[PDB]
Design an enzyme around this catalytic site. Structure first.
Site, PDB file in Angstrom:
ATOM      1  N   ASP A 131     125.255  90.613 -18.494  1.00 25.88           N
ATOM      2  CA  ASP A 131     125.372  89.155 -17.731  1.00 25.88           C
ATOM      3  C   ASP A 131     123.717  89.032 -17.464  1.00 25.88           C
ATOM      4  OD1 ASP A 131     127.128  88.123 -19.207  1.00 25.88           O
ATOM      5  OD2 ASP A 131     128.727  87.953 -17.184  1.00 25.88           O
ATOM      6  N   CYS A 159     122.071  83.159 -29.910  1.00 26.93           N
ATOM      7  CA  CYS A 159     122.232  83.273 -28.172  1.00 26.93           C
ATOM      8  C   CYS A 159     122.015  81.267 -27.970  1.00 26.93           C
ATOM      9  CB  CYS A 159     121.389  84.068 -27.352  1.00 26.93           C
ATOM     10  SG  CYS A 159     119.430  83.442 -27.715  1.00 26.93           S
ATOM     11  N   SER A 160     121.992  81.615 -26.698  1.00 19.91           N
ATOM     12  CA  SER A 160     121.490  80.223 -25.441  1.00 19.91           C
ATOM     13  C   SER A 160     121.008  79.482 -26.477  1.00 19.91           C
ATOM     14  CB  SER A 160     122.119  80.746 -24.097  1.00 19.91           C
ATOM     15  OG  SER A 160     120.609  81.039 -24.026  1.00 19.91           O
ATOM     16  N   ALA A 161     119.868  80.409 -25.767  1.00 22.41           N
ATOM     17  CA  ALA A 161     118.495  78.517 -26.467  1.00 22.41           C
ATOM     18  C   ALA A 161     118.145  79.597 -28.170  1.00 22.41           C
ATOM     19  CB  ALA A 161     117.294  79.066 -25.784  1.00 22.41           C
ATOM     20  N   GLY A 162     118.791  80.739 -28.105  1.00 24.44           N
ATOM     21  CA  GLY A 162     118.160  80.928 -29.409  1.00 24.44           C
ATOM     22  C   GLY A 162     116.527  81.737 -30.150  1.00 24.44           C
ATOM     23  N   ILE A 163     115.822  82.672 -28.706  1.00 23.70           N
ATOM     24  CA  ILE A 163     114.479  82.699 -28.837  1.00 23.70           C
ATOM     25  C   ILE A 163     114.989  84.225 -28.321  1.00 23.70           C
ATOM     26  CG2 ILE A 163     113.336  80.271 -28.675  1.00 23.70           C
ATOM     27  CD1 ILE A 163     113.175  81.005 -25.579  1.00 23.70           C
ATOM     28  N   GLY A 164     115.555  84.565 -27.053  1.00 22.53           N
ATOM     29  CA  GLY A 164     115.395  85.363 -26.147  1.00 22.53           C
ATOM     30  C   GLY A 164     116.172  86.763 -26.907  1.00 22.53           C
ATOM     31  N   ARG A 165     117.556  86.443 -26.791  1.00 20.30           N
ATOM     32  CA  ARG A 165     118.671  87.736 -26.837  1.00 20.30           C
ATOM     33  C   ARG A 165     118.384  87.877 -28.548  1.00 20.30           C
ATOM     34  NH1 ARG A 165     123.910  87.353 -24.008  1.00 20.30           N
ATOM     35  NH2 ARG A 165     123.134  87.383 -21.690  1.00 20.30           N
ATOM     36  N   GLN A 204     111.717  86.777 -25.143  1.00 19.20           N
ATOM     37  CA  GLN A 204     111.893  85.787 -23.485  1.00 19.20           C
ATOM     38  C   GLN A 204     110.520  87.122 -22.741  1.00 19.20           C
ATOM     39  OE1 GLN A 204     112.994  81.836 -23.575  1.00 19.20           O
ATOM     40  NE2 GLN A 204     115.158  83.303 -23.318  1.00 19.20           N
TER      41      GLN A 204
END
EC number: 3.1.3.48
Length: 261
Positions: free
Chosen positions: A161, A195-201, A242
């Site tokens: 997390d 993933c949440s925003a679709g950029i980091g993970r 990110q």
């Protein structure tokens, strides 16, 4: 091979469609939007809807295999997500988050329970079997228009997390299974990653996968250039990869992969 020669800090196009009033409630985060030139454009929408072609998602082409990088579904975008999977002939979905992480929603559940079926707008989805491995659950989904095809959802279990995994073994075993699944299915479409925003993970998974694929073709001796590869993906969706911990995790994962060979 996978040596870090440059620091993360050295890494630091129109988005009109995502900016339209009609599309405002289809974005999880107000200023993380898909570039127009690579956005997934949804066809065949409800003709009663003046705007039915939008989802916050981009095609990523390394420059074979390609990807769709997208955000986790909102309650009002679940139906649009399955329209995208269908239209793009995607057969493998890589989900990199829990539904809720530290009490914040990351993704609305868009799949039915094992041995159930649900209709999401015009799309019918049956969950015929789940397999729960240490690092991930695999869901064997059957998707049809209410024309059937199996969509394999690889739902990674173990991403912490806070920060990134401290070793890449789990991600590498997971990616290797994704690789073989995709290659087992004739002419499968882009691999969907979210993933949440679709950029980091999402960016981290995609860049690792791109570099491991280069090693599969050219062997363990270079040339790999991780900053060049990140810039190349960032020209297709804003801001992929990110954090500095994600950036270090990419080199660690590629180095470990070389170690297996």
């Amino acid at each position: 091979g996978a040596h870090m020669w440059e620091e993360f800090e050295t890494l630091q196009y129109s988005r009109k469609e995502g900016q339209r009033q009609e599309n405002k409630n289809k974005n999880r985060y107000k200023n993380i939007l898909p570039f127009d030139h690579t956005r997934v454009v949804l066809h065949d929408g409800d003709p009663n809807e003046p705007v039915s072609d939008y989802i916050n998602a981009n095609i990523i082409m390394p420059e074979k295999k390609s990807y769709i990088a997208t955000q986790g579904c909102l309650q009002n975008t679940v139906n649009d997500f399955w329209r995208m999977v269908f239209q793009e002939n995607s057969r493998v979905i890589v989900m990199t988050t829990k539904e809720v992480e530290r009490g914040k929603s990351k993704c609305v559940k868009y799949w039915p329970d094992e041995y159930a079926l649900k209709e999401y707008g015009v799309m019918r989805v049956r969950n015929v079997k789940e397999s729960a491995a240490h690092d991930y659950t695999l869901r064997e989904l059957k998707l049809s228009k209410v024309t059937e095809r199996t969509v394999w959802q690889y739902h990674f279990r173990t991403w912490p997390d806070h920060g990134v995994p401290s070793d890449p073994g789990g991600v590498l075993d997971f990616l290797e299974e994704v690789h073989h699944k995709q290659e087992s299915i004739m002419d499968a479409g882009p691999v969907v990653v979210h993933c949440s925003a679709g950029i980091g993970r999402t960016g981290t998974f995609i860049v690792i996968d791109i570099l491991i694929d280069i090693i599969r073709e050219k062997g363990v001796d270079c040339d790999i250039d991780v900053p060049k590869t990140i810039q190349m993906v960032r020209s297709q969706r804003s801001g992929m990869v990110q954090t500095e911990a994600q950036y270090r995790f990419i080199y660690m994962a590629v180095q470990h992969y070389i170690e297996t060979l």
